Amino acid sequence: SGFRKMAFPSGKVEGCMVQVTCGTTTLNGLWLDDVVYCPRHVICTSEDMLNPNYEDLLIRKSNHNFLVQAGNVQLRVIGHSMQNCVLKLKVDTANPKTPKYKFVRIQPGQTFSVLACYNGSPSGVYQCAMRPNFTIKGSFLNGSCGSVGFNIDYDCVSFCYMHHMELPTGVHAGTDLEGNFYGPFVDRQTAQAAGTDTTITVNVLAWLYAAVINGDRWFLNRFTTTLNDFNLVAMKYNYEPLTQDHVDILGPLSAQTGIAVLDMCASLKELLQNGMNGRTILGSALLEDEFTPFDVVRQCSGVTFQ
Amino acid sequence: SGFRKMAFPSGKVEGCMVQVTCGTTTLNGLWLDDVVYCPRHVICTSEDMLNPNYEDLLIRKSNHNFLVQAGNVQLRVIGHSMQNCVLKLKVDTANPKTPKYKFVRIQPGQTFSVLACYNGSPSGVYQCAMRPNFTIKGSFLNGSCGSVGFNIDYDCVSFCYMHHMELPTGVHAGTDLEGNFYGPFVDRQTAQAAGTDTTITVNVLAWLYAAVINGDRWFLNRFTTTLNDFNLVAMKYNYEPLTQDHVDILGPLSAQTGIAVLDMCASLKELLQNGMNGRTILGSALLEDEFTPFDVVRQCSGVTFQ
Numbered sequence: 001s002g003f004r005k006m007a008f009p010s011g012k013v014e015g016c017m018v019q020v021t022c023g024t025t026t027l028n029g030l031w032l033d034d035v036v037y038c039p040r041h042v043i044c045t046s047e048d049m050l051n052p053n054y055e056d057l058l059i060r061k062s063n064h065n066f067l068v069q070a071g072n073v074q075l076r077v078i079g080h081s082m083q084n085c086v087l088k089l090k091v092d093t094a095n096p097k098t099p100k101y102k103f104v105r106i107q108p109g110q111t112f113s114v115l116a117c118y119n120g121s122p123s124g125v126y127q128c129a130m131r132p133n134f135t136i137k138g139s140f141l142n143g144s145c146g147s148v149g150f151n152i153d154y155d156c157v158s159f160c161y162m163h164h165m166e167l168p169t170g171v172h173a174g175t176d177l178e179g180n181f182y183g184p185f186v187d188r189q190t191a192q193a194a195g196t197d198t199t200i201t202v203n204v205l206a207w208l209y210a211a212v213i214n215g216d217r218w219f220l221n222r223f224t225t226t227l228n229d230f231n232l233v234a235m236k237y238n239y240e241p242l243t244q245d246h247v248d249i250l251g252p253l254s255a256q257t258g259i260a261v262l263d264m265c266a267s268l269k270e271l272l273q274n275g276m277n278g279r280t281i282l283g284s285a286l287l288e289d290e291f292t293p294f295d296v297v298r299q300c301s302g303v304t305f306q
Numbered sequence: 307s308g309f310r311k312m313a314f315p316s317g318k319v320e321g322c323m324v325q326v327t328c329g330t331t332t333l334n335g336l337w338l339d340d341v342v343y344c345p346r347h348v349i350c351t352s353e354d355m356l357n358p359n360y361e362d363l364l365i366r367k368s369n370h371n372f373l374v375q376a377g378n379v380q381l382r383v384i385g386h387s388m389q390n391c392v393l394k395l396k397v398d399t400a401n402p403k404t405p406k407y408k409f410v411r412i413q414p415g416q417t418f419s420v421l422a423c424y425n426g427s428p429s430g431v432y433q434c435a436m437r438p439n440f441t442i443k444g445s446f447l448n449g450s451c452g453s454v455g456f457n458i459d460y461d462c463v464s465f466c467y468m469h470h471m472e473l474p475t476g477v478h479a480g481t482d483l484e485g486n487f488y489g490p491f492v493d494r495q496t497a498q499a500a501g502t503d504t505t506i507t508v509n510v511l512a513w514l515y516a517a518v519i520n521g522d523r524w525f526l527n528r529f530t531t532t533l534n535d536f537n538l539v540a541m542k543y544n545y546e547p548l549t550q551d552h553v554d555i556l557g558p559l560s561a562q563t564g565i566a567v568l569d570m571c572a573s574l575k576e577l578l579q580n581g582m583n584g585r586t587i588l589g590s591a592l593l594e595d596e597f598t599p600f601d602v603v604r605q606c607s608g609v610t611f612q
């Protein structure tokens with residue numbers, strides 16, 4: 001029992017983190033086989049990151065302008081190319097710690113683990129969700145760009161995020177590992193802002209099921225609701241719509257607890273309309289929306305990775 | 307910016323986890339140099355864990371009664387001994403992945419990372435605090451016993467916790483790595499219960515400083531308080547006393563923010579007396595007490611580990 005914001009073991013990713021330096025700019029890179037991936041804004045100085053022409057900045061660079069450090073061991077760069085917003089640095093040594101991996105792009109609503117890094121050295125690991133507005137509520141300081149987000153499935157690391165920037169509200173934006181930004185953000189200095197967010201409804205429902213599995217039942221009730229009537233209430237409280245696929249995905253958790261999905265929707269309705277009245281759910285006084293149905297099944301059932 | 311429940315990178319500990327099997331009992335062990343550490347209740351069956359005489363149970367065992375698996379590679383046990391509530395299994399191979407380590411015992415109020423494991427295979431990583439009542443609010447299923455808690459300081463892993471059992475309220479108890487339980491718990495079947503807990507005051511204050519550093523200031527006020535007058539209020543709300551050493555420890559965070567410690571106490575007072583009035587602090591609607599002053603400095607300043 002218990003329920004925690006739980007990340008994947010980070011060791012497989014720790015063995016890929018390196019430090020990339022170009023001029024006075026130092027950030028983090030990801031070393032898989034004989035390529036180091038990193039943000040292309042590694043080639044920018046302070047005045048460069050205003051309206052940068054990255055193609056122009058890159059043709060002015062040489063292989064020897066890039067220093068890659070894997071621990072205390074220097075990696076010789078033998079090739080470089082730009083792909084969207086990431087740089088690909090060909091090095092003369094393949095990483096012997098390369099795990100089985102994929103480059104995947106995730107959906108808003110999905111979760112992943114983040115291994116925060118500084119100067120190529122891992123600092124901490126935590127769980128994040130992709131917000132509906134394509135930002136993430138991360139924890140990142142200066143120098144963290146290049147840190148990656150990932151999921152692990154058995155032995156295989158699915159890299160889904162590379163960190164680039166902080167937005168003015170303190171939230172974070174970055175790219176998938178092909179260099180394509182999540183959401184309407186660019187790797188330059190503009191007035192870009194997050195734009196409005198919503199609560200991830202299916203995840204809140206998953207977490208209420210997590211609570212029932214763990215013995216919190218005070219918020220249950222005898223009422224039911226229709227999907228349409230629930231969706232009317234969700235829209236009023238800035239929750240995103242619930243679909244029949246969301247209902248289907250919640251099926252196993254429904255069947256394990258004996259609580260129909262639309263019955264749990266009725267509970268969520270009351271919670272939105274009445275608040276929590278001085279009580280808590282899984283140690284929280286807010287409706288938590290950063291656990292997916294998969295996350296709940298994994299933690300309340302117990303799947304490992306090798 | 308941002309503030310997350312952040313664990314240490316787990317890779318150094320992943321390389322020490324093994325599976326230990328005795329009869330039909332399978333759990334997790336920690337392999338450092340040529341010793342595997344695990345709970346001594348590995349030698350108990352179902353009827354054994356009622357009023358077990360562990361000395362009697364152990365003398366009946368042989369080296370070959372213990373199967374240790376490190377991945378898909380079997381480890382030959384060449385010696386065994388009991389030390390308090392842990393078993394020490396001497397194996398014929400030293401773990402080549404042994405990090406620099408220490409066995410430390412932590413204080414209630416301190417935090418650590420937990421690498422949850424099943425069948426010797428890591429499942430997830432998260433942050434925990436030692437509660438004042440010496441339990442931990444973990445996330446553990448059957449088979450997790452033997453999982454360890456730890457902190458990392460540069461390159462050195464300080465192991466502080468080995469998981470043993472779940473108590474009836476869903477919280478968890480275990481030992482330090484010398485086999486000595488945290489709190490008044492025993493590795494047998496009794497009606498043992500957690501006993502009353504308190505909120506870790508110095509940690510709440512640290513977290514309010516974390517919030518100010520990150521831009522939440524709504525809870526600040528012009529009032530101050532004396533240490534004695536604050537401690538009168540804390541006792542009424544089941545917070546533990548704040549000492550002059552707590553005030554000293556909060557010094558750097560006070561100086562970084564320009565908010566005197568006793569001024570932040572005045573804010574906490576008002577928060578305890580008035581609630582949070584529909585607002586949140588660092589994304590939480592409760593006063594959070596599982597970050598130490600060290601945790602806040604590490605995350606809001608950015609220290610790594612190698």
Ligand SMILES: *[C@@H](*)C(=O)N(c1ccccc1)c1cncc(Cl)c1
Pocket residue numbers: 025026027039041042044045046049143145146164165166187188189
């Ligand atoms: C990612 C990175 O290294 N950035 C810096 C920081 C300082 C000098 C050059 C580059 C960075 C950080 N945040 C946003 C952007 Cl566009 C670049």
Ligand SMILES: *[C@@H](*)C(=O)N(c1ccccc1)c1cncc(Cl)c1
Pocket residue numbers: 331332333345347348350351352355449451452470471472493494495
């Ligand atoms: C730690 C462990 O392996 N336990 C079991 C579980 C099933 C059979 C034997 C031993 C265990 C779990 N929780 C409490 C205690 Cl005293 C033992």
